[PDB]
Design a protein around this nucleic acid. Sequence first.
RNA 1: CAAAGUUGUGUAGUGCGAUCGGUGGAUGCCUUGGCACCAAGAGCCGAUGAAGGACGUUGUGACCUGCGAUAAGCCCUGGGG
Length: 69
Amino acid sequence: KLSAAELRQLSGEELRNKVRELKEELFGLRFQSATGQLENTARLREVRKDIARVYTVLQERNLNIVDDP
RNA sequence: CAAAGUUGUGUAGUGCGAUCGGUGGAUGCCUUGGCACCAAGAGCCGAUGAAGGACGUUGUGACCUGCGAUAAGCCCUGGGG
Ligand SMILES: [Mg+2]
């Protein structure tokens, strides 16, 4: 569970690196789910919620909802 | 013993009554649903793309509800526990 408060302290480039890392983790989780692995099925949804959190932070910086560092 | 005579008939089935069941879903009692109104609102939405949908969306098979690849959900804010 990422926190939007922490992500709001990160800068844009590290936030996008976080987006890409989360996408890669979701890819790996889906492959494990397909192949019979993945005991931890909650992380499969939590990584997508984390992607949503990072997108919310990035877009609120883009739309000036919160000041962009 | 023989004669003459009389009377009787359920081993197939059936009727009526009682009794015991089956089927059926009436009756009674209800209700996550309607009907008729009352009081207060609100009286438009849409190219910043509507009304209405198609497809997808859950850990997993479908459907309803919600949502849209940020997909039964993301953030801020107040409440509450
Ligand atoms: Mg019945």
